Design a protein around this ligand. Structure first.
Ligand code: HEM
Ligand code: HEM
Lengths: 362, 361
């Protein structure tokens, strides 16, 4: 229930321990006034300082002038901060505005097309994003709702996604959660404590070529539908061969414990862990921070389940791209389909009560 | 951390309200009474396992390699999480298996109400399973696996996820707030009032349908809220809509949330004034609904609202008169009913040998 500090060299919500619920929104900008947009970034930062501390935005949710709408919509009243983090990111399409083209980072690479892609252009892309994570979904919704409200006229919501439960871990000392295919997910991820691994694989550095990004990261979001009907009729052995780990313990094939190191040659050549593993990808390493979703039925008598996949990396070209290319022959492909996609530059942290989101860019 | 599954009544009605909801409505595809009864027995066995935190069948792993696991596995290593599973039968069930003359009179079709805009695909259903739990993944896993067991005999018609309070951070003697920002649930039938439940909630034998004694009747309504319109309304307009203030939830003129309302001090079309049993000939409901937020629609708006669930001893004398009295509710400006269904919720599974629906079949 405690708060997660908002200030830092880095934005919270990345190396932070992974909170139970997610509300992810992508925004398009509807003002051509750079001054208006900068004032928005400052106002949103002020709201976030309140929101992540458990306080109502502006002058509160009630007790103001009767004839004016309340500053805060009020549904988080009486709730604790619940580890709320707010993480902001800039889409490639934002740099065509306010004269930012010269500032687009080289590591904000558009993704190539991948075999199997069935991307819905409505649930893809976006000028900027806010990732709201909390252990209470009312807290996460309230923050997105109130950010959008404050941005009325300057931004609209392009698309959003709710994650009802995490499928990722930055704390290997705690239990690994399972995804909706029933497998532990997050065993071999980067930990929030591994400060040297985060420096090499996650945080952008001055020398990488884009000084305003020093301290930030790069985010890939993929909405991935799961063919649970097809999966749920596969034998237990078939499911375990697809991944290279047993279902119960989550141990690499042949071994006894979830955290024993995989021996890649014992796995099938198209096994998911074998293909995604850094050793198979020239050392490429990712920080996975995704969440499960279900969005009703598919209209055909079945539940609609999937995974909202989020990966943070130091450079999209040396993180997500090579690992995803190596998955062209993944046995998991038979059961999944990518149906939404977006990349964002996540700027450095808000340094103190005078700093603001995107201040190094603007 | 668990709720007993066996009882005179099904759990999940008067038992403590859990944090999360997965509601699913199923359509029946088989015509065979025997095949259906068989399924009901299978379902009860799996429910016993799930509500105690165990995997269904022979488990999620450790079986024949060339067999699909009995349990899909995503709840492994989680606790029972106060999971309750409540099953109900829709009016359309009674057109099959020759049960037409066993439909309870109290399971009345709903009239059309002013402002209804019901989506057909998210309405109705031959039967429903309400899964509540403090962990959403426990709830989802239950529905997922019940649907799997029933494949070939039932399909999922529509499904709804919902959330109330988060109990690991909020006190249970603290009223939750709906997404309009008002405390919700202040004047409600509580699970402790065993005589109000008998008078208002539970079906009794002399009511007319003996197989439903110990049961209840469920109305579900998917109510969209026009969030962005509501949020532009003044604080005074919002409080005028309900007849309570937003901060404390006190009825107008009163000081504490739990002070009894003085209905003449509220606006004639205030929501509380129109819904109160005194304005409805004593009609009283047990509300057990959950908030929802499914995402954003095509115009950038929050697809969010209240998935309203009401239990009552007779639909004709509970939900119907009260909803009728809301014809002029000032709240109507800000909400839209977009989905609807009714169900007869049978009595409870009495012991290890009993099963869902046994009194009917
Ligand atoms: C629904 C889609 C996916 C599912 C269900 C899934 C599932 C899993 C599972 C069960 C594991 C083993 C446990 C672990 O170490 O975390 C794993 C590992 C991993 N996955 Fe995936 N995954 C999916 C998509 C992806 C994608 C799209 C990528 C990258 C583009 C990816 C990259 C990785 C990596 C790097 C590992 C760690 C392998 C290692 O270093 O040992 N996964 N995944
Ligand atoms: C979006 C839809 C709705 C919202 C946001 C809402 C909200 C509220 C609120 C804030 C209260 C006051 C506190 C309390 O719960 O006692 C209330 C009371 C109540 N509402 Fe609603 N409600 C909705 C729909 C309905 C419907 C459809 C019905 C019945 C058909 C209903 C029946 C009642 C009743 C019986 C009370 C208790 C009044 C009393 O006896 O004091 N509500 N509602």
């Amino acid at each position: 229930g405690s708060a997660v500090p908002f200030h830092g060299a880095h934005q919270a919500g990345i190396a932070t321990p992974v909170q139970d619920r997610l509300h992810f929104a992508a925004f398009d900008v509807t003002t051509e006034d750079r001054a208006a947009f900068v004032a928005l970034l400052k106002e949103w930062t002020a709201a976030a300082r309140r929101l992540t501390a458990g306080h109502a935005v502006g002058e509160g949710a009630y007790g103001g002038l009767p004839e004016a709408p309340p500053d805060d919509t009020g549904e988080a009243l009486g709730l604790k901060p619940s580890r709320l983090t707010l993480t902001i990111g800039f889409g490639p399409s934002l740099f065509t505005r306010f004269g930012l083209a010269d500032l687009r980072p080289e590591a904000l690479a558009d993704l190539p097309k991948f075999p199997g892609d069935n991307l819905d252009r409505a649930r893809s892309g976006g000028d900027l994003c806010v990732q709201a994570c909390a252990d209470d979904p009312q807290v996460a919704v309230h923050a997105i709702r109130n950010l959008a409200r404050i941005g009325f006229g300057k931004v609209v919501v392009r698309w959003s996604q709710l994650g009802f439960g995490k499928t990722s871990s930055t704390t290997p000392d705690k239990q690994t959660p399972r995804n909706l295919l029933g497998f532990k997910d997050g065993t071999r991820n980067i930990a929030g404590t591994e400060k040297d691994r985060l420096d090499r694989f996650v945080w952008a550095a001055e020398k990488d070529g884009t000084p305003w990004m020093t301290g930030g990261s790069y985010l890939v979001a993929r909405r991935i539908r799961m063919h649970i009907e097809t999966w749920d009729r596969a034998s237990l052995q078939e499911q375990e061969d697809v991944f290279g780990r047993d279902k119960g313990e989550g141990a690499p094939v042949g071994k006894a414990k979830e955290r024993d190191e995989p021996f890649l040659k014992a796995m099938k050549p198209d096994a998911h862990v074998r293909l995604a593993h850094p050793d198979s990808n020239g050392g490429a390493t990712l920080l996975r921070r995704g969440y499960s979703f279900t969005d009703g039925t598919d209209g055909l008598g079945r539940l609609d389940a999937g995974l909202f996949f989020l990966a943070y990396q130091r450079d999209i070209r040396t993180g997500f791209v090579p690992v995803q290319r190596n998955l062209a022959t993944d046995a998991l492909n038979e059961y999944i389909q990518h149906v939404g996609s977006a990349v964002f530059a996540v700027p450095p942290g808000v340094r103190d009560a005078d700093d603001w989101w995107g201040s190094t860019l603007f």
